[PDB]
Structures are given as C-alpha cells and as structure tokens.
Design a protein around this ligand. Structure first.
Ligand SMILES: Cc1cc2nc3c(=O)[nH]c(=O)nc-3n(C[C@H](O)[C@H](O)[C@H](O)COP(=O)(O)OP(=O)(O)OC[C@H]3O[C@@H](n4cnc5c(N)ncnc54)[C@H](O)[C@@H]3O)c2cc1C
Ligand SMILES: Cc1cc2nc3c(=O)[nH]c(=O)nc-3n(C[C@H](O)[C@H](O)[C@H](O)COP(=O)(O)OP(=O)(O)OC[C@H]3O[C@@H](n4cnc5c(N)ncnc54)[C@H](O)[C@@H]3O)c2cc1C
Ligand SMILES: Cc1cc2nc3c(=O)[nH]c(=O)nc-3n(C[C@H](O)[C@H](O)[C@H](O)COP(=O)(O)OP(=O)(O)OC[C@H]3O[C@@H](n4cnc5c(N)ncnc54)[C@H](O)[C@@H]3O)c2cc1C
Ligand SMILES: Cc1cc2nc3c(=O)[nH]c(=O)nc-3n(C[C@H](O)[C@H](O)[C@H](O)COP(=O)(O)OP(=O)(O)OC[C@H]3O[C@@H](n4cnc5c(N)ncnc54)[C@H](O)[C@@H]3O)c2cc1C
Lengths: 216, 219, 218, 212
C-alpha cells in the first residue's frame, strides 16, 4: 500500500517490514517485555555512538522497478538479499527508461534537450526491433537480449536491514551519485522514514554523511 | 506466544517474524500479488529441490535465546545473521549456570556416580561465583572480575536470521555430530520454523536437510 | 610468481593477479598449525574436510582475478555476494569501448531462419549504431553517465575480483553447469582452470565430493 | 613470522599476507600494471571513502587469546575463523598493575592471587572429571573464561580497519585493546601507506593516534 513512482516507468513499492523503532530498542536491551521519551533517547544514544547492530533487527522487503544501469549500482550492496525477475517463473515485459528533456537541462548541449531524448528513444526502438527479429528467426532469448540497451527496465525484490539501508542511503542519497539512483534513494528514504521515524531522525541527525536528505 | 524452555534455565523465544512461505513464492516470481495453493506449494518444493535458495532469504525471524556461553560460542560462529548480546550498560545482568542432570551423564562409563559429577560441577560453580562476588565487593570492576566465571554461565541474545541461513544452522546443529546441548536448541528453532513456514520446512526436510535428527524426532 | 591469463570470447579474459596460500593453507587452518607438507595425511585431511562439508578451512585460500567480460556476464557474476569487486571507472584510468559479438559457430546449434553469419552481422550493426549514437551524444555535450544508457549489454567491462576458495567452489557449482548461459560457462571454465593449477588437491577433492555441476568433469 | 606477545601467555602471529599497498592501487585502477603517485592515490581513496580497493589486501593471523577476548573478537563477521578443536590448558592471570587504578579494599597482588587460586581449583576439578571418565566437552564447562584458545583469522584490510576502529579504542576492554595494537603493528609494517592514510582519514578510535 506504499508505492512511489520513479523516473518514467519505474517504482519502489514496500512489500513487507518486520518491526519498527522499538525493535532496535528491544534488541539493544535484549528484552521481549511504556515510555516513549526514554525509548527515543536510547535510539538517539545508539546512533551517535555507532552502536549500529541493534538496527539490524529492523528488516524491509521492497519491490523495485529500475533500469539496468541503476540496478547494477544498487546490486553492489552485498549485505542484503536480491531476487531478479526471470522469465523462468513469471512473464517478462520490455520497457525502457527515456530521460525527460528537463533531466538534461542543466547541461549546455549542441543539440536541444528534446533531440537527446528522441535519439535515446530511436536506439531503443531499433535495438528492440532487432531483438524481436532475432527471436523470430530462432536465436534464443538469452542470446538475443545482449543487443538491448542498459536503460531496459528490470524488477527485483530487495530485503535489507535498517543498518544496511542506512549505509545504502549514505552512498546513494547524495548529490554525487547519478541522478537516477538519487531518486530511488529518496524513495527508499521516504518509506524508511514512514516506518521508523525515530531511527530516521536520529540517522539524519548523527550518522548521515550525504546531503540530499537535508534538502528535499 | 512461542517460548520453549531448553536445558535447566535456557529458552528459545520467538520475538518476530517477517513473512511466511508465500514470501518466498512472491520473491521468486518478483511480484507482490492471484494466490493458488497447489501451485505455490509446488513452487516451494521446486526451489528447494533444484537449490534455488535465494527466495528463502526473504523470510526473516528474530529469536530471543537464553543459553550457556559454551553453547553461545558455537552458535555465534554462524556469521550470516545479526546478534545482540546482553551487556548490560543497557539492562541488568543476572548469574545462572548450566548444571547437567545426572540423566545427561549416564551412558558414559565413569568411575564415579553420575550424581557425584553433578555435585562436583555445582560445587566448583558455587566457588567461582563466590570469588567473583568477593572481587566485586572489593572494588574490582565487573569486566575484570567475571573472567573467573565458568563457561556454563548463561547469557542472552537476540538473533535475527533469514530462513536460508536458518536452514544452514539446522543442517549443522540439528545433527548427532553437534554437541547434545546445541542439538536441543536447534530442535526448538526447528519447531518454531516449522510452525511459521510449514511448507518450506517440509521441503527442506525432503530435499535439502543433511542432518539426521529432524527426520526422526517429530517437530 | 603467480600470473596466468586465459582468453575468453572474442576480446575477454580472466587473469590471475595474486593468490594467498595453497592446499596446505587449508590444512594449517583446520589444525591451527604450521605444517608444511606427511603428504598422505595432508591429502587425506583435504578429502576429509571436503566430504563432510567442513569448508571453513578453504576460506583461508584466497585469489585475486582481473576479469574482462561483457556487462551481461558481469551482472550474473556480481550476484556472488561473498567476495570483493572493483570495477573499472574513468576516474582512475582509461575507459575503452569494445563489444562482444558472438561467432557464427556459437549460433549454429540453433535451427535459425537465417544463416548464422547474418545473425552475427545484425548484432554487429545494431551495436555499431548504438555506439555511434553514444559518441554523437558525448560530442553534443551530454554527460557520459547519461549518454552511456544507450549502450548494449554486450559492452565489455573490467573488474578485480578477490574471492576465497570456498566461495569460489560455490561460484563453480552455479556457473560451471550446462544450464548456465554458454558465455558464463566459458568464464567458469577459466576460473576452474586457474583454481586447479593453484590448488590441485582442493580442486580434485571438490570434483569428487562436492562439485554439483556437469561440465568440469568433461 | 612476525610474532608479538600479548598479556601473560598470549600472542598474535602473522601466518600469511596477500598483497601490499600496491594491491589496493592495482584494484582501484583495475590494471595489472612512481612511488608518490601511488601513495597519493591511497590517500585519495581513504579520504574520499572509496574503501573497496582495500578489500584486495588480505591477512591470515594466528592468535592465542583468552576466551573472553576471543568471543568479543569473533563478533567481527566479515572474516574467516578456524579455532583449535581436538589441546593445552593455560589461563590469563591479570598483573597487579592491571588492577591498580580503582580504589580496591585489598591489595592488587591479593586480587591476582585470588584469581589464580580459583583458576587452579577449577582446572583441578576439570582434571578429576576427565580422570573419572566424563567426556571432555562436558567436563570443560567448569573452566573459566580466562582459558586461552587459539584460532586462525583471515581478514581483508578494509574489515581489518573496521576491527581497529572498534577494538583499538579506550571503550573496548584493556585486553582486546592490547591485541588490537599488535594487529595494528603488523598491518602498518606490511601496508605502511594504507595504515598512515587510515589514521589520517578514516580511523575513529583514539589510542592509535598516540600509541606508536
Ligand atoms: C567516492 C567513491 C568512488 C568509488 N569509485 C568506484 C569504482 O571506480 N569502482 C567500483 O567498483 N566501485 C567504486 N566505489 C564503490 C561503489 O560505491 C560500490 O558500488 C559500493 O561502495 C559498495 O558499497 P559497500 O561495500 O559499502 O556496501 P555493502 O556491499 O552493502 O557492504 C556494507 C558494509 O559492509 C562491509 N563489507 C561488506 N562486505 C565486505 C567485505 N567482503 N570486506 C570488507 N568489508 C565488507 C563494508 O564495511 C561496507 O561498508 C566508489 C565509492 C565511493 C564512495
Ligand atoms: C566498545 C564496544 C562496546 C560493545 N557493546 C556491545 C553490546 O552491548 N552488545 C553486543 O552484542 N555487542 C557489543 N559490541 C560488539 C559490537 O556490537 C559488534 O558486534 C562488533 O564490534 C562487531 O562490529 P561490526 O558489526 O562492525 O563488524 P562485522 O560484524 O565484521 O561487520 C563489519 C561491517 O559490515 C557490515 N555488516 C556485516 N554484517 C551485517 C549485517 N548482517 N547487517 C548489516 N550490516 C552488516 C557493517 O556495516 C559493519 O561495518 C561492542 C563493541 C565495542 C567495540
Ligand atoms: C542466479 C542466482 O540465483 C544467483 O546469481 C545466485 O543464486 C547467488 O549465489 P549465492 O547467494 O549462493 O552466492 P553468494 O551470493 O556469494 O552467497 C554465497 C553463500 O553465502 C550464503 N549467503 C550469503 N548471503 C546470504 C544471505 N543474505 N542469506 C542467507 N545466506 C547467504 C549462502 O549460503 C551462499 O551459499
Ligand atoms: C559438528 C561441528 C564441528 C565443528 N568443529 C569446529 C572446529 O574444530 N573449529 C572451528 O573453528 N569451528 C568448528 N565448527 C564451526 C564451523 O566450522 C562453522 O564455523 C559453523 O558451523 C558455521 O557454519 P557456516 O560458516 O556454514 O555458517 P555461516 O557462517 O552463517 O555461513 C553460512 C554460509 O555462508 C557462507 N559464508 C559466510 N561467510 C563466508 C566467507 N567469509 N567465505 C566464504 N563463505 C562464507 C558459506 O557458504 C556458509 O555455508 C564446527 C561446527 C559443527 C557444526
């Protein structure tokens, strides 16, 4: 019931979550068996001192639709669990990330922004037409797809604990990461903030090393 | 809800769980939806049969475990998991020790009665603890004084572990090669696992589990 | 001195950069000792560890590889999380643009409605068009990080991969198999070849007791 | 093998090392191919948080340490461990000077003696139980936490630096601090440039900045 559209056809969707701020408090105290302000104080204490292991007992599963070039950076985060859509279990669709002209406003190019978009669209169509021609002629899908561009969309499930999510955000929710992964990072951050507000607030306050979460 | 007493003062308690069997099915398909039970059960078996283990990483457990240090050290060898042990600058410590029952000790041919061995362990534990307390009342900080305490001191921890890594744990620990004490804990972890993810556990036993005991000892 | 290089596909390769240890590193680890090789007894322990799934000692043998592979290969490769990766960026060295074009013979096998040579040619033409589009966008002032999204998945990349023998055996179980894509198998055959050269007892034990694929036995 | 003695019977010893500072440089450039240029890149990587190249430097240590120390140590998950299975029996007895600092009600030499006495009683009880036919992995449970153990530890430089951030610090117990200083000494000998860069840019502990 929480879904954020990203880019032209992408999204981040929350699938499941185990626990909440109090799950890191329980883990830190090692107690299954109310005081809101002392609980927050502890969450703040854990964050400013680098006792990050309690945040490992807060887990999220997201469903992400993202271009391959985004997914390749994302998948470098080893301390998480990934499953990528494979034709073997469910149907594949072929969709592509076409940047908006606004996205290239910033840079001062020889060719109008809209012409850049159009050239990217053109390649997508030619590459996808060639892929289909190869399929129809008997080249297996696994071989034919190597002509498709890096802006082809993929989907995956990503299960990650809050600790690893904070590291993800430190590296990706930053103005040095490419813009496409920043947008996904912002969405990940919003969901995390909704489910674990005290942890998120303590994170921004003490640990967060980036910039874009302190603006937008 | 779920708590199982283990040994003389130990337990395994379920704190939380994310997902169920269908969490693995949804991860393998990569969709968050048109349920079909026979279809979804076949898929679980399929995955386990052909070693496609990764979808099982999207089921996650947190357990609260009370166990002796010698058990905890064997346990903490499982690195693909999250641990938090009671310290406690955060909460209060108490001092209880595991004393094997005479029944635990019969089967061994010893030169003295099993109960005598119980008595001797109890006595040395009592002396060690008394010395500890003695050192504390003298001004010796706890972190120093505690090094005289024996390996059968109970500790507590939270353990967050996904179902794949939990299956690896059970392969190693729910098995007659493991020490009897950690076997007991692994049987309790297996019962909770089965209760929460019955189809995966059944598929695990049928296709993947390399230990002996779970296919003999119910639950 | 450790150095080996095996050429893979048209332009790819797998190059051995360094190795820590040898078969006896696993024996030393298992015994917590400095034994140096009693050969009967050390080999028997290697088989023993391998047979019974006691693989932790094999973690103390470590390889660093330099791999040049198409992006579609590197993506499946990088799914192996218990390992260390560093991929070529332009911040520290020269970026090159080369692409994997399969051969006719690779495309025989399948009963295609056009000759395999024409399939190869069609792939070359669309790759060429994408690349020229990439270069035209760069010349127009488009940042490389944006322009590059039109490049296809057969673009070669390079990376360093550091990985322990245990995780490498798991890599070979999954990738050295007649179900993996052919290009994947080729790379897994080169990794295997080096592993065998450097840890022959571990490798032979792996084949006998633990190896789950089919192509390494061939 | 570089071997440093720690505590009364402990040690850290280097078993093997893969690479050196240049391994991180090669990893960063992704190339199997000028000393100050290379030192500059090391500092750059560390300064800008590009730590992954330091994962391609690997060490194997042989450590003899008390169990209370080994438990803290084994908490570091991004490493490979093999512990001695089956054995010898030695115990760490804190020196008097270790126990000076706090006002105690008895002299620190007495406290040391009290530790030693209870250690001997416990070990004596362990030996009687084995003598009686009690299996060793049951009998051993009466032995105290200051029993020494031995393990091999294979760890990369990046994870080594996280371990030093946490253990080579005034907040860790004095004993693991001693082992961390020794691990640091060896790391610095084998990777002087990575280690200097680490202190100057990434290291969040205190003691390594003033304990040479
Ligand atoms: C300024 C900068 C420039 C970069 N340039 C490049 C480049 O050119 N090429 C390139 O490939 N990458 C580069 N990177 C790294 C790139 O960002 C990776 O995609 C990403 O950093 C992987 O992040 P991680 O290892 O922190 O996360 P994860 O893989 O999730 O690991 C999480 C944390 O666990 C620890 N960890 C996990 N596994 C290990 C392990 N095996 N050994 C030691 N510690 C471990 C680390 O401490 C890490 O902080 C660069 C990073 C930065 C910050
Ligand atoms: C002064 C001090 C006081 C302490 N007090 C306590 C206490 O009260 N209770 C207690 O249990 N422990 C305590 N510890 C131990 C501490 O909590 C850590 O378990 C230990 O220091 C290992 O740290 P690590 O998790 O960074 O190292 P590793 O386990 O090697 O991990 C290294 C890096 O990998 C990443 N990583 C690895 N695995 C995961 C994962 N599963 N999820 C997310 N990220 C991961 C992290 O980013 C981390 O930086 C204490 C330690 C110190 C030094
Ligand atoms: C296609 C294919 O599904 C993937 O490329 C492949 O399954 C990933 O392989 P792996 O996880 O076995 O290897 P890696 O991703 O290198 O993992 C290797 C081993 O580590 C363990 N492992 C690593 N991370 C986790 C985790 N998060 N949860 C449970 N087990 C883990 C597994 O036992 C696995 O055999
Ligand atoms: C009967 C028995 C006897 C034992 N005897 C000894 C002994 O004498 N000495 C001793 O030290 N220990 C001993 N152990 C502990 C044992 O060696 C393992 O450390 C423990 O069982 C954890 O198993 P694991 O590494 O598979 O689990 P985890 O550590 O959770 O790992 C799960 C899986 O993830 C992967 N993985 C995680 N980290 C790495 C890594 N760095 N490299 C490669 N793969 C990785 C592996 O594929 C592994 O199977 C014993 C255990 C048992 C059950």
């Amino acid at each position: 019931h929480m879904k954020i559209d990203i880019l032209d056809k992408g999204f981040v969707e929350l699938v499941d979550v185990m626990g909440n701020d109090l799950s890191a408090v329980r883990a830190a105290r090692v107690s299954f068996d109310k005081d809101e302000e002392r609980d927050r104080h502890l969450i703040e204490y854990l964050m400013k001192h680098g006792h990050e292991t309690p945040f490992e007992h807060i887990v999220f599963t997201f469903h992400v639709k993202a271009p391959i070039f985004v997914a390749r950076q994302w998948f470098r985060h080893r301390i998480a669990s990934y499953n990528e859509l494979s034709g073997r279990y469910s149907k594949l669709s072929y969709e592509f990330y076409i940047p908006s002209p606004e996205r290239l406003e910033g840079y001062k190019t020889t060719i109008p922004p809209e012409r850049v978009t159009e050239k990217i669209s053109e390649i997508v169509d030619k590459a996808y037409r060639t892929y289909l021609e190869l399929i129809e002629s008997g080249v297996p899908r696994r071989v034919a797809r190597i002509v498709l561009p890096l802006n082809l969309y993929t989907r995956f499930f990503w299960t990650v604990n809050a600790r690893s999510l904070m590291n993800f955000l430190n590296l990706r929710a930053d103005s040095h990461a490419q813009w496409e992964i920043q947008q996904y990072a912002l969405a990940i951050a919003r969901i995390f903030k909704e489910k674990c507000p005290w942890t998120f607030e303590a994170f921004l306050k003490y640990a967060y090393k980036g910039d874009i979460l302190k603006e937008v």
